[PDB]
Design a protein around this ligand. Structure first.
Ligand SMILES: CCCCc1nc(CO)c[nH]1
Length: 300
């Protein structure tokens, strides 16, 4: 069994490198962030441009949705995160505290908290309602490449160029576990038992969190430079999805570790991929020679 992702839409409009694409939890929208300082909202199913959300003074490296699909958070080189009302496009809160570029962000499942990672080497936990910083974790000794909450928000996982992945107790801010090439991306599996980690030696690893053991390795792609997003595809077959510095989207069989598809079409590094929550749909986005988002559809 292999997927058969085919190109459905090319989304043009960002004037510099795209940095991150994320599907709304309700499956309706794609949000994109860019070095052009803009967030753009697109129809997930028809690829139709919806709106531009603006206000950051420098490039945006990441964007994330609240669980109810009503809010976005963005992470910017202007050293702030911003919370946006998607319907109005208005900035509700500017989260101030990082002393350098904010690189990565995510809401917890409740969406009362935001976690951020920065070049300042810290992870911050923010109150969504007040916009106040609740905790500053001295998480790493180099830029923080990724931050993600587990399924119930009890844990945070962070990755860094220092070569560490760390698991934090959300409530206390205390480090429960440390798992050395730079770690360029990390996220929990949907069930929260595993962590998917990218290292800048062209390697993805599936870690059993509780055991601290490497279960799977995915190779064949190019990743020596950029913090490329990877995903668990769960809507059809159980795949691993990642961009690559050879301008392709890679899809592996999670269990066998075999490459089952490579998606051709991008004309620069595929920095970000996202899996639709209910349909067999991938969004991919590329750096400044390309600046487009592609939507792909598969039968499985
Ligand atoms: C400038 C390109 C940034 C892309 C990016 N990758 C991640 C992984 O967490 C966050 N942002």
């Amino acid at each position: 069994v292999k997927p058969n992702y085919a190109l459905k839409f090319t989304l043009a409009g960002h004037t510099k490198a795209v940095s991150s694409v994320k599907f709304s939890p309700n499956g309706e929208w794609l949000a994109s962030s860019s070095a052009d300082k803009l967030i753009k909202i697109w129809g997930a199913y028809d690829g139709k441009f919806e709106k531009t959300i603006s206000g950051h003074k420098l490039g945006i490296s990441d964007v994330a949705w609240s669980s109810d699909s009503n809010l976005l958070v963005s992470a910017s080189d202007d050293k702030t995160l911003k919370i946006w009302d998607v319907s109005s496009g208005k900035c509700l809160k500017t989260l101030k505290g990082h002393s350098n570029y904010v690189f990565c962000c995510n809401f917890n499942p409740q969406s009362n908290l935001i976690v951020s990672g920065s070049f300042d080497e810290s992870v911050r936990i923010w109150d969504v309602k007040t916009g106040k910083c609740l905790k500053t974790l001295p998480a790493h000794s180099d830029p923080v490449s990724a931050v993600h909450f587990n399924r119930d928000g009890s844990l945070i996982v962070s990755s860094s160029y220092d070569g560490l992945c760390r698991i934090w107790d959300t409530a206390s801010g205390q480090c429960l576990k440390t798992l050395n090439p730079p770690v360029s991306f990390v996220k929990f599996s949907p069930n929260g038992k595993y962590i998917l980690a990218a290292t800048l030696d062209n390697t993805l690893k599936l870690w059993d969190y509780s055991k601290g053991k490497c279960l799977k390795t995915y190779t064949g792609h190019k990743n020596e430079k950029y913090c490329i997003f990877a995903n668990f595809s769960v809507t059809g077959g159980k795949w691993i999805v990642s961009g690559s510095e050879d301008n392709l989207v890679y899809i592996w069989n999670l269990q066998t570790k075999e490459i089952v598809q490579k998606l051709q079409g991008h004309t620069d590094v595929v920095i970000s991929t996202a899996c639709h929550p209910t349909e067999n749909i991938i969004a991919s986005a590329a750096l400044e020679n390309d600046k487009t988002i592609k939507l792909w559809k598969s039968d499985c």
